[PDB]
Protein backbone atom coordinates (compact mmCIF):
# COMPACT_ATOMS: atom_id res chain seq x y z
CA UNK A 1 0.00 0.00 0.00
CA UNK A 2 1.13 3.29 0.19
CA UNK A 3 2.39 5.44 2.83
CA UNK A 4 2.19 8.38 2.01
CA UNK A 5 -1.18 9.81 -0.32
CA UNK A 6 -1.66 13.31 -0.07
CA UNK A 7 -4.52 15.24 -2.13
CA UNK A 8 -2.08 17.62 -4.08
CA UNK A 9 -1.33 14.03 -5.86
CA UNK A 10 -1.69 13.57 -9.64
CA UNK A 11 -4.20 10.43 -9.64
CA UNK A 12 -6.81 12.68 -7.84
CA UNK A 13 -7.07 15.26 -10.73
CA UNK A 14 -7.13 13.01 -13.36
CA UNK A 15 -10.93 13.81 -14.90
CA UNK A 16 -13.65 16.62 -14.62
CA UNK A 17 -15.96 14.35 -11.76
CA UNK A 18 -12.31 15.16 -9.79
CA UNK A 19 -12.36 18.76 -9.70
CA UNK A 20 -16.08 18.46 -9.37
CA UNK A 21 -15.92 16.90 -6.29
CA UNK A 22 -12.99 18.66 -4.93
CA UNK A 23 -15.24 21.42 -5.56
CA UNK A 24 -17.70 20.32 -3.46
CA UNK A 25 -15.10 19.74 -0.35
CA UNK A 26 -14.39 23.00 -0.46
CA UNK A 27 -17.91 24.47 0.33
CA UNK A 28 -17.81 22.04 2.48
CA UNK A 29 -14.55 23.57 4.28
CA UNK A 30 -16.25 26.91 4.33
CA UNK A 31 -19.63 25.56 5.76
CA UNK A 32 -17.09 24.73 9.17
CA UNK A 33 -17.03 28.66 9.07
CA UNK A 34 -20.54 29.52 9.66
CA UNK A 35 -20.86 29.79 13.44
CA UNK A 36 -17.81 32.09 13.08
CA UNK A 37 -19.53 34.12 10.15
CA UNK A 38 -22.45 34.66 12.37
CA UNK A 39 -20.47 35.77 15.62
CA UNK A 40 -18.25 37.84 13.42
CA UNK A 41 -20.93 39.74 11.87
CA UNK A 42 -23.81 39.94 14.50
CA UNK A 43 -23.52 39.82 18.75
CA UNK A 44 -20.81 42.10 19.25
CA UNK A 45 -24.05 44.97 18.54
CA UNK A 46 -26.68 45.85 20.18
CA UNK A 47 -29.24 42.53 19.62
CA UNK A 48 -28.18 40.36 22.91
CA UNK A 49 -26.48 41.14 26.59
CA UNK A 50 -29.68 40.22 28.98
CA UNK A 51 -29.67 37.40 31.27
CA UNK A 52 -30.91 33.61 29.69
CA UNK A 53 -34.52 33.98 31.02
CA UNK A 54 -34.55 30.26 31.85
CA UNK A 55 -31.45 30.56 34.04
CA UNK A 56 -28.32 29.41 31.95
CA UNK A 57 -24.95 30.38 32.54
CA UNK A 58 -23.62 32.26 29.77
CA UNK A 59 -20.58 30.93 30.33
CA UNK A 60 -18.29 33.71 28.42
CA UNK A 61 -20.58 34.35 25.48
CA UNK A 62 -21.62 37.55 27.26
CA UNK A 63 -17.89 38.91 26.28
CA UNK A 64 -19.32 39.42 23.01
CA UNK A 65 -22.36 42.12 23.75
CA UNK A 66 -20.05 43.02 26.40
CA UNK A 67 -17.17 43.83 24.52
CA UNK A 68 -15.00 42.46 27.07
CA UNK A 69 -13.24 40.30 24.81
CA UNK A 70 -9.47 40.20 25.31
CA UNK A 71 -6.13 38.67 24.92
CA UNK A 72 -7.03 36.18 27.53
CA UNK A 73 -10.65 35.06 26.32
CA UNK A 74 -10.91 36.49 22.30
CA UNK A 75 -14.16 35.22 21.55
CA UNK A 76 -13.25 33.74 18.37
CA UNK A 77 -9.39 31.90 17.71
CA UNK A 78 -6.70 30.95 14.78
CA UNK A 79 -8.89 33.63 12.45
CA UNK A 80 -12.02 31.89 12.93
CA UNK A 81 -10.49 28.54 10.92
CA UNK A 82 -10.37 30.34 7.85
CA UNK A 83 -6.60 29.95 7.10
CA UNK A 84 -7.45 26.31 6.38
CA UNK A 85 -9.93 26.86 3.64
CA UNK A 86 -7.90 29.54 2.39
CA UNK A 87 -5.35 26.68 2.09
CA UNK A 88 -7.65 24.77 0.02
CA UNK A 89 -8.72 27.13 -2.34
CA UNK A 90 -5.60 27.53 -3.03
CA UNK A 91 -4.86 24.18 -4.08
CA UNK A 92 -8.25 24.26 -6.66
CA UNK A 93 -6.83 27.53 -7.89
CA UNK A 94 -3.34 25.76 -9.16
CA UNK A 95 -4.80 22.76 -10.04
CA UNK A 96 -7.33 24.41 -12.17
CA UNK A 97 -5.14 27.14 -13.90
CA UNK A 98 -2.90 23.91 -14.46
CA UNK A 99 -5.20 21.47 -15.71
CA UNK A 100 -5.77 19.56 -19.27
CA UNK A 101 -8.84 17.68 -18.67
CA UNK A 102 -11.41 20.82 -18.15
CA UNK A 103 -13.79 22.93 -20.74
CA UNK A 104 -12.22 26.13 -20.81
CA UNK A 105 -15.77 27.27 -20.09
CA UNK A 106 -15.95 24.77 -16.99
CA UNK A 107 -11.99 25.72 -15.96
CA UNK A 108 -12.95 29.45 -15.73
CA UNK A 109 -17.00 28.89 -13.66
CA UNK A 110 -14.49 26.93 -10.86
CA UNK A 111 -11.93 29.93 -10.99
CA UNK A 112 -15.53 32.06 -10.62
CA UNK A 113 -16.49 29.95 -7.48
CA UNK A 114 -12.20 29.96 -5.76
CA UNK A 115 -11.27 33.54 -6.38
CA UNK A 116 -15.01 34.29 -5.26
CA UNK A 117 -14.83 32.26 -2.18
CA UNK A 118 -11.70 33.72 -1.27
CA UNK A 119 -12.16 37.38 -1.40
CA UNK A 120 -15.09 36.37 0.76
CA UNK A 121 -13.13 34.80 3.70
CA UNK A 122 -9.83 37.85 3.34
CA UNK A 123 -12.65 40.29 3.89
CA UNK A 124 -14.11 38.82 7.15
CA UNK A 125 -10.29 38.99 7.89
CA UNK A 126 -9.87 42.15 7.14
CA UNK A 127 -12.92 43.53 8.59
CA UNK A 128 -12.36 41.16 11.62
CA UNK A 129 -8.63 41.52 12.59
CA UNK A 130 -7.52 43.81 10.18
CA UNK A 131 -3.94 43.47 9.39
CA UNK A 132 -3.54 39.75 8.09
CA UNK A 133 -1.25 37.45 6.70
CA UNK A 134 -1.64 37.41 2.81
CA UNK A 135 -1.75 32.95 1.71
CA UNK A 136 -1.90 32.50 -1.83
CA UNK A 137 -0.33 29.19 -2.13
CA UNK A 138 -0.57 25.68 -1.09
CA UNK A 139 1.40 24.47 1.19
CA UNK A 140 0.62 20.47 2.77
CA UNK A 141 7.45 32.25 9.83
CA UNK A 142 5.49 35.14 8.34
CA UNK A 143 4.03 38.73 9.06
CA UNK A 144 0.99 39.84 8.06
CA UNK A 145 0.09 42.95 5.63
CA UNK A 146 -1.19 46.30 6.16
CA UNK A 147 -4.98 45.76 5.82
CA UNK A 148 -4.47 48.45 2.50
CA UNK A 149 -2.58 45.53 1.08
CA UNK A 150 -5.11 42.85 2.03
CA UNK A 151 -7.73 44.84 0.61
CA UNK A 152 -6.17 45.01 -2.93
CA UNK A 153 -5.72 41.35 -2.76
CA UNK A 154 -9.38 41.09 -1.61
CA UNK A 155 -10.12 43.33 -5.09
CA UNK A 156 -7.83 41.60 -7.62
CA UNK A 157 -9.35 38.27 -6.45
CA UNK A 158 -13.03 39.93 -7.17
CA UNK A 159 -11.73 40.86 -10.75
CA UNK A 160 -10.19 37.33 -11.45
CA UNK A 161 -13.56 35.86 -10.10
CA UNK A 162 -15.19 38.17 -12.56
CA UNK A 163 -13.45 37.28 -15.07
CA UNK A 164 -13.76 33.66 -14.46
CA UNK A 165 -17.42 33.53 -14.64
CA UNK A 166 -17.81 36.31 -17.96
CA UNK A 167 -21.33 37.38 -17.94
CA UNK A 168 -22.84 33.92 -17.14
CA UNK A 169 -24.79 35.25 -13.89
CA UNK A 170 -26.89 31.05 -13.72
CA UNK A 171 -26.42 29.66 -10.28
CA UNK A 172 -24.59 26.68 -12.39
CA UNK A 173 -24.52 24.01 -9.11
CA UNK A 174 -27.31 25.64 -7.25
CA UNK A 175 -27.76 28.60 -4.79
CA UNK A 176 -25.72 26.51 -2.18
CA UNK A 177 -22.63 27.07 -4.20
CA UNK A 178 -20.91 29.93 -5.50
CA UNK A 179 -22.03 31.75 -8.56
CA UNK A 180 -21.71 35.42 -10.32
CA UNK A 181 -24.25 37.12 -8.08
CA UNK A 182 -22.41 35.69 -5.03
CA UNK A 183 -19.31 37.77 -6.27
CA UNK A 184 -21.13 40.48 -7.33
CA UNK A 185 -22.86 41.03 -3.65
CA UNK A 186 -19.42 40.81 -1.90
CA UNK A 187 -18.14 43.13 -4.97
CA UNK A 188 -20.63 45.63 -3.60
CA UNK A 189 -19.93 45.02 0.40
CA UNK A 190 -16.34 45.29 -0.82
CA UNK A 191 -16.23 48.82 -2.82
CA UNK A 192 -18.84 50.32 0.11
CA UNK A 193 -16.34 49.63 3.08
CA UNK A 194 -13.29 50.24 0.54
CA UNK A 195 -15.29 53.81 -0.20
CA UNK A 196 -16.34 54.42 3.35
CA UNK A 197 -13.84 52.82 5.68
CA UNK A 198 -10.63 53.28 3.38
CA UNK A 199 -11.11 56.77 1.59
CA UNK A 200 -12.57 55.47 -1.92
CA UNK A 201 -15.23 57.89 -1.69
CA UNK A 202 -17.55 58.71 -4.67
CA UNK A 203 -15.51 56.21 -6.92
CA UNK A 204 -15.77 53.35 -4.98
CA UNK A 205 -19.87 54.22 -4.36
CA UNK A 206 -20.70 54.48 -7.98
CA UNK A 207 -18.61 50.90 -8.21
CA UNK A 208 -20.78 48.74 -5.71
CA UNK A 209 -24.37 50.45 -7.27
CA UNK A 210 -23.32 49.08 -10.40
CA UNK A 211 -22.24 45.25 -8.79
CA UNK A 212 -25.49 45.35 -6.97
CA UNK A 213 -27.62 46.75 -10.22
CA UNK A 214 -26.06 43.74 -12.29
CA UNK A 215 -27.97 41.35 -9.72
CA UNK A 216 -30.99 43.29 -10.40
CA UNK A 217 -30.66 43.07 -14.05
CA UNK A 218 -29.27 39.58 -14.93
CA UNK A 219 -29.59 37.23 -12.36
CA UNK A 220 -32.94 35.39 -11.37
CA UNK A 221 -33.84 36.53 -7.85
CA UNK A 222 -37.23 37.74 -6.57
CA UNK A 223 -38.39 38.39 -2.59
CA UNK A 224 -40.40 35.37 -1.53
CA UNK A 225 -44.02 36.87 -0.88
CA UNK A 226 -43.91 35.00 2.78
CA UNK A 227 -40.84 36.51 4.48
CA UNK A 228 -41.23 33.46 6.90
CA UNK A 229 -40.71 31.18 3.79
CA UNK A 230 -37.53 32.27 3.18
CA UNK A 231 -36.00 29.80 5.84
CA UNK A 232 -38.25 27.34 5.79
CA UNK A 233 -36.42 23.89 5.90
CA UNK A 234 -38.03 22.54 2.69
CA UNK A 235 -37.96 25.93 0.35
CA UNK A 236 -34.26 26.11 0.32
CA UNK A 237 -33.60 26.63 -3.34
CA UNK A 238 -35.92 29.61 -3.43
CA UNK A 239 -35.33 32.50 -5.83
CA UNK A 240 -34.83 34.86 -3.23
CA UNK A 241 -31.45 32.56 -2.40
CA UNK A 242 -28.16 34.26 -3.48
CA UNK A 243 -25.61 31.98 -1.34
CA UNK A 244 -26.65 30.15 1.45
CA UNK A 245 -24.75 27.44 3.43
CA UNK A 246 -26.34 24.41 2.98
CA UNK A 247 -27.05 22.47 5.99
CA UNK A 248 -28.70 18.73 5.83
CA UNK A 249 -29.35 15.28 7.78
CA UNK A 250 -26.19 12.94 8.40
CA UNK A 251 -24.26 15.69 6.69
CA UNK A 252 -23.97 18.75 9.01
CA UNK A 253 -26.00 20.82 11.99
CA UNK A 254 -26.46 24.68 11.61
CA UNK A 255 -23.60 26.00 12.84
CA UNK A 256 -22.58 22.25 13.56
CA UNK A 257 -24.52 22.34 16.22
CA UNK A 258 -23.71 25.78 17.74
CA UNK A 259 -27.41 27.14 16.74
CA UNK A 260 -29.22 24.82 19.69
CA UNK A 261 -26.56 25.19 21.99
CA UNK A 262 -26.62 29.00 22.22
CA UNK A 263 -29.45 30.10 21.05
CA UNK A 264 -32.66 27.48 21.24
CA UNK A 265 -34.37 27.03 24.38
CA UNK A 266 -33.53 24.31 26.89
CA UNK A 267 -36.87 21.36 26.83
CA UNK A 268 -37.24 20.51 30.86
CA UNK A 269 -37.82 24.72 32.03
CA UNK A 270 -40.08 25.51 28.66
CA UNK A 271 -42.24 22.49 29.50
CA UNK A 272 -41.98 22.77 33.39
CA UNK A 273 -42.56 26.33 33.62
CA UNK A 274 -43.37 28.42 30.73
CA UNK A 275 -46.81 29.22 28.46
CA UNK A 276 -47.81 31.12 25.47
CA UNK A 277 -49.43 34.60 25.70
CA UNK A 278 -52.73 32.40 25.98
CA UNK A 279 -51.33 30.48 29.22
CA UNK A 280 -50.75 26.99 27.31
CA UNK A 281 -48.24 25.50 28.32
CA UNK A 282 -45.31 24.66 26.30
CA UNK A 283 -45.40 20.78 27.42
CA UNK A 284 -48.58 20.92 25.10
CA UNK A 285 -47.17 23.23 22.15
CA UNK A 286 -44.88 22.69 19.22
CA UNK A 287 -42.36 24.53 20.95
CA UNK A 288 -42.01 21.82 23.42
CA UNK A 289 -39.74 20.09 20.59
CA UNK A 290 -37.19 22.67 20.92
CA UNK A 291 -33.63 21.84 22.95
CA UNK A 292 -31.36 23.59 23.34
CA UNK A 293 -29.56 26.28 25.84
CA UNK A 294 -29.34 30.13 25.57
CA UNK A 295 -25.97 31.57 26.40
CA UNK A 296 -26.93 34.70 24.13
CA UNK A 297 -29.99 36.23 25.22
CA UNK A 298 -32.12 38.54 22.83
CA UNK A 299 -32.74 42.04 24.85
CA UNK A 300 -35.98 41.66 26.19
CA UNK A 301 -37.20 45.05 25.50
CA UNK A 302 -35.70 44.56 21.46
CA UNK A 303 -39.44 42.42 20.55
CA UNK A 304 -41.61 45.22 21.26
CA UNK A 305 -39.19 48.15 20.12
CA UNK A 306 -37.89 46.40 16.93
CA UNK A 307 -40.78 46.39 15.17
CA UNK A 308 -44.14 48.59 13.77
CA UNK A 309 -47.75 46.72 13.95
CA UNK A 310 -48.29 44.99 10.65
CA UNK A 311 -44.92 43.62 10.51
CA UNK A 312 -44.79 40.14 9.52
CA UNK A 313 -41.03 39.70 10.15
CA UNK A 314 -41.62 40.31 14.37
CA UNK A 315 -43.35 36.81 14.45
CA UNK A 316 -41.15 35.33 11.90
CA UNK A 317 -37.66 36.41 13.90
CA UNK A 318 -39.03 36.03 17.23
CA UNK A 319 -41.25 33.44 19.58
CA UNK A 320 -42.22 35.74 22.91
CA UNK A 321 -42.04 33.65 26.67
CA UNK A 322 -45.00 34.02 29.22
CA UNK A 323 -45.29 32.76 32.50
CA UNK A 324 -48.45 32.24 34.59
CA UNK A 325 -48.50 34.42 37.76
CA UNK A 326 -49.93 33.33 41.46
CA UNK A 327 -52.59 36.02 40.53
CA UNK A 328 -53.63 34.12 37.25
CA UNK A 329 -51.82 36.81 34.64
CA UNK A 330 -49.59 35.83 32.11
CA UNK A 331 -46.69 37.67 32.17
CA UNK A 332 -44.29 38.62 29.44
CA UNK A 333 -40.77 37.01 30.05
CA UNK A 334 -38.51 37.23 27.09
CA UNK A 335 -37.73 36.23 23.54
CA UNK A 336 -36.18 33.60 21.51
CA UNK A 337 -35.40 33.23 17.70
CA UNK A 338 -38.11 31.84 15.48
CA UNK A 339 -36.05 32.43 12.03
CA UNK A 340 -34.59 28.88 12.39
CA UNK A 341 -37.09 26.16 13.28
CA UNK A 342 -35.61 23.21 12.12
CA UNK A 343 -37.59 20.03 11.46
CA UNK A 344 -39.09 17.15 13.49
CA UNK A 345 -37.65 14.19 11.70
CA UNK A 346 -39.84 10.93 11.53
CA UNK A 347 -40.45 9.61 15.06
CA UNK A 348 -38.68 12.42 16.93
CA UNK A 349 -39.07 13.72 19.87
CA UNK A 350 -36.56 16.92 19.74
CA UNK A 351 -36.48 19.06 17.09
CA UNK A 352 -33.16 18.78 14.56
CA UNK A 353 -31.81 22.25 13.25
CA UNK A 354 -31.39 21.53 9.75
CA UNK A 355 -32.10 24.82 8.32
CA UNK A 356 -29.62 26.40 5.92
CA UNK A 357 -27.91 29.40 7.02
CA UNK A 358 -28.27 32.68 4.03
CA UNK A 359 -25.17 34.29 3.22
CA UNK A 360 -26.48 36.66 0.77
CA UNK A 361 -30.31 37.02 -0.22
CA UNK A 362 -32.32 39.35 -2.56
CA UNK A 363 -33.48 41.39 0.36
CA UNK A 364 -29.57 42.50 1.03
CA UNK A 365 -28.75 43.31 -2.50
CA UNK A 366 -31.84 46.00 -2.63
CA UNK A 367 -30.56 47.34 0.92
CA UNK A 368 -26.89 47.70 -0.11
CA UNK A 369 -28.28 49.00 -3.26
CA UNK A 370 -29.79 51.41 -1.21
CA UNK A 371 -26.93 51.94 1.19
CA UNK A 372 -24.90 52.73 -2.12
CA UNK A 373 -27.73 55.26 -3.27
CA UNK A 374 -27.46 56.88 -0.14
CA UNK A 375 -23.79 57.18 -0.05
CA UNK A 376 -23.44 59.06 -3.54
CA UNK A 377 -26.84 61.41 -2.35
CA UNK A 378 -28.93 59.38 -4.77
CA UNK A 379 -32.92 58.84 -3.58
CA UNK A 380 -33.05 55.26 -1.86
CA UNK A 381 -36.86 55.01 -1.96
CA UNK A 382 -37.65 52.28 -4.36
CA UNK A 383 -34.93 49.46 -2.69
CA UNK A 384 -36.32 50.77 0.92
CA UNK A 385 -39.99 50.75 -0.27
CA UNK A 386 -39.79 47.11 -2.15
CA UNK A 387 -38.58 45.45 0.70
CA UNK A 388 -40.82 47.18 3.17
CA UNK A 389 -43.79 46.38 0.80
CA UNK A 390 -43.00 42.55 1.34
CA UNK A 391 -42.54 42.62 5.40
CA UNK A 392 -45.80 44.53 5.73
CA UNK A 393 -47.72 42.38 2.69
CA UNK A 394 -48.60 44.27 -0.11
CA UNK A 395 -52.36 45.69 0.63
CA UNK A 396 -51.30 46.43 4.18
CA UNK A 397 -48.63 48.05 3.13
CA UNK A 398 -50.44 50.56 0.49
CA UNK A 399 -53.29 51.30 2.59
CA UNK A 400 -50.75 52.75 5.31
CA UNK A 401 -48.12 54.13 3.04
CA UNK A 402 -48.60 57.41 5.09
CA UNK A 403 -46.83 55.90 8.17
CA UNK A 404 -44.93 52.86 6.75
CA UNK A 405 -43.93 53.74 3.33
CA UNK A 406 -39.95 55.34 3.54
CA UNK A 407 -40.09 58.17 4.65
CA UNK A 408 -42.38 58.73 6.61
CA UNK A 409 -41.61 55.56 9.37
CA UNK A 410 -41.10 58.21 12.06
CA UNK A 411 -42.54 59.81 15.46
CA UNK A 412 -43.46 58.51 18.54
CA UNK A 413 -42.60 54.84 18.14
CA UNK A 414 -38.22 56.14 18.02
CA UNK A 415 -38.45 58.57 21.00
CA UNK A 416 -36.84 56.34 23.81
CA UNK A 417 -35.99 53.71 21.09
CA UNK A 418 -31.94 52.92 21.36
CA UNK A 419 -31.96 50.47 18.32
CA UNK A 420 -33.08 52.90 15.60
CA UNK A 421 -34.70 56.12 15.03
CA UNK A 422 -37.02 57.88 12.25
CA UNK A 423 -36.54 58.12 7.86
CA UNK A 424 -35.07 61.62 8.47
CA UNK A 425 -31.98 60.46 8.38
CA UNK A 426 -31.51 57.91 4.79
CA UNK A 427 -28.63 56.21 6.37
CA UNK A 428 -30.47 55.25 10.12
CA UNK A 429 -33.49 54.47 7.87
CA UNK A 430 -31.06 52.08 5.79
CA UNK A 431 -29.72 50.87 9.21
CA UNK A 432 -33.18 50.13 10.86
CA UNK A 433 -34.47 48.45 7.51
CA UNK A 434 -31.57 45.83 8.02
CA UNK A 435 -31.58 45.72 11.73
CA UNK A 436 -35.45 44.78 11.05
CA UNK A 437 -34.83 42.08 7.86
CA UNK A 438 -31.67 40.56 9.19
CA UNK A 439 -31.52 39.64 12.62
CA UNK A 440 -30.16 36.30 13.43
CA UNK A 441 -28.22 36.57 10.05
CA UNK A 442 -24.91 38.16 11.09
CA UNK A 443 -24.91 41.30 9.56
CA UNK A 444 -25.87 43.85 12.56
CA UNK A 445 -22.11 44.21 14.13
CA UNK A 446 -20.84 44.52 10.41
CA UNK A 447 -23.13 47.61 9.50
CA UNK A 448 -22.64 49.44 12.27
CA UNK A 449 -18.94 49.12 11.75
CA UNK A 450 -19.19 49.83 7.94
CA UNK A 451 -20.70 53.51 8.50
CA UNK A 452 -17.69 54.26 10.99
CA UNK A 453 -17.21 54.25 14.86
CA UNK A 454 -19.64 56.51 16.13
CA UNK A 455 -22.58 54.92 14.18
CA UNK A 456 -20.92 51.68 16.36
CA UNK A 457 -19.96 53.37 20.17
CA UNK A 458 -23.54 55.07 20.16
CA UNK A 459 -25.50 51.46 20.00
CA UNK A 460 -22.66 49.34 21.15
CA UNK A 461 -20.59 49.05 24.43
CA UNK A 462 -17.10 48.57 22.16
CA UNK A 463 -14.35 51.50 22.60
CA UNK A 464 -12.78 52.83 19.13
CA UNK A 465 -9.81 51.59 20.08
CA UNK A 466 -11.15 48.24 20.01
CA UNK A 467 -12.96 47.66 17.29
CA UNK A 468 -11.13 44.52 15.73
CA UNK A 469 -10.89 41.27 17.32
CA UNK A 470 -7.69 40.10 19.67
CA UNK A 471 -5.57 36.80 18.42
CA UNK A 472 -5.50 34.74 21.20
CA UNK A 473 -2.47 33.04 22.72
CA UNK A 474 -1.74 29.40 20.90
CA UNK A 475 -1.46 31.84 17.63
CA UNK A 476 1.36 34.50 18.40
CA UNK A 477 3.26 31.42 20.39
CA UNK A 478 3.29 29.38 17.10
CA UNK A 479 3.75 32.36 15.17
CA UNK A 480 6.37 34.96 16.39
CA UNK A 481 6.16 37.42 13.64
CA UNK A 482 2.46 37.85 14.04
CA UNK A 483 1.55 41.41 16.59
CA UNK A 484 -1.33 41.43 18.86
CA UNK A 485 -4.20 43.47 17.53
CA UNK A 486 -3.69 47.26 18.07
CA UNK A 487 -6.15 48.22 21.35
CA UNK A 488 -5.40 45.03 23.25
CA UNK A 489 -2.11 45.91 25.92
CA UNK A 490 -2.52 45.88 29.61
NA1 LIG B 1 -21.14 52.92 23.65
Same mark, same amino acid.
Request: charged share 25%; glycine share 6%; with cysteine.
Given at each position: ?28 ? &? ?44 ? !? ?11 ? !? ?194 ? &? ?205
Amino acid at each position: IDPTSSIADSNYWKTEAQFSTFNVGLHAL &LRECSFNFFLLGEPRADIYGDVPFGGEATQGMERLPFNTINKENTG !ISNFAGMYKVINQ !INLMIAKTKETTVLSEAGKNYYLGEAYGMRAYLYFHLLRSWGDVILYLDYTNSKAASPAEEVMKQIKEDITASEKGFGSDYSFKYGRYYWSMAATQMLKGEVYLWSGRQMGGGTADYTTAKTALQSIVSNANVSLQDDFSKVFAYNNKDNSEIIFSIRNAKDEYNMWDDRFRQNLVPQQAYMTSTYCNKEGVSFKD &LPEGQLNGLIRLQIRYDLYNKAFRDGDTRKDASMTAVYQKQQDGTVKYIAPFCNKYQGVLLDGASQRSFLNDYPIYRYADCLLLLAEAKALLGEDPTAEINQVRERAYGKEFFEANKATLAYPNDKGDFYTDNKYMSGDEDPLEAILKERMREFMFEGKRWYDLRLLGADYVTKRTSAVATRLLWPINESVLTDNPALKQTPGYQN
